[PDB]
Design a protein. Structure first.
Ligand SMILES: [Cl-]
Ligand SMILES: [Cl-]
Ligand SMILES: [Cl-]
Ligand SMILES: [Cl-]
Ligand SMILES: [Cl-]
Ligand SMILES: [Cl-]
Ligand SMILES: [Cl-]
Ligand SMILES: [Cl-]
Ligand SMILES: [Cl-]
Ligand SMILES: [Cl-]
Ligand SMILES: [Cl-]
Ligand SMILES: [Cl-]
Ligand SMILES: [Cl-]
Ligand SMILES: [Cl-]
Ligand SMILES: [Eu+2]
Ligand SMILES: [Eu+2]
Ligand code: NA
Length: 128
């Protein structure tokens, strides 16, 4: 599923991402934009051979099992394929663990590089 901007914002908010670990809603929407362009079906290989899955591009090196990432952990106890669902419940639940891991949203390199320090509130501009 490709989410609308305000649609995804509404969904993330309902799942409790709004100011989760102090990260306001726009931070989360902004991250999704540059990780997946709002597409729950997005997958991308990383150089280390792990794969990123879903709206928030959650890595198979640590967070989910895809069965082809050697020496990896499945810390959200979930098959990676479940992060591609049009229901973002699993991604959001997993993202809460990731963001709580110590470095906050810096875990998403694209967030640090493209969202951090910017006017992220614009990402929820006009949404109810
Ligand atoms: Cl957009
Ligand atoms: Cl990740
Ligand atoms: Cl694996
Ligand atoms: Cl393969
Ligand atoms: Cl290896
Ligand atoms: Cl594990
Ligand atoms: Cl599995
Ligand atoms: Cl949803
Ligand atoms: Cl933090
Ligand atoms: Cl990670
Ligand atoms: Cl990441
Ligand atoms: Cl800005
Ligand atoms: Cl801006
Ligand atoms: Cl915001
Ligand atoms: Eu990646
Ligand atoms: Eu760690
Ligand atoms: Na894994």
């Amino acid at each position: 599923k490709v989410f609308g901007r305000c649609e995804l914002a509404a969904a993330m908010k309902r799942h409790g991402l709004d100011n989760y670990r102090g990260y306001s809603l726009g931070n989360w929407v902004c991250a999704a934009k540059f990780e997946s362009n709002f597409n729950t079906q997005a997958t991308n290989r990383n150089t280390d051979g792990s794969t990123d899955y879903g709206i928030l591009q959650i890595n198979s090196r640590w967070w989910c099992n895809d069965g082809r990432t050697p020496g990896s952990r499945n810390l959200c106890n979930i098959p990676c394929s479940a992060l591609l669902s049009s229901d973002i419940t699993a991604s959001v639940n997993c993202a809460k663990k990731i963001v709580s891991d110590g470095n906050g949203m810096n875990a998403w390199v694209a967030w640090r590089n493209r969202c951090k320090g910017t006017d992220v509130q614009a990402w929820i501009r006009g949404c109810r």
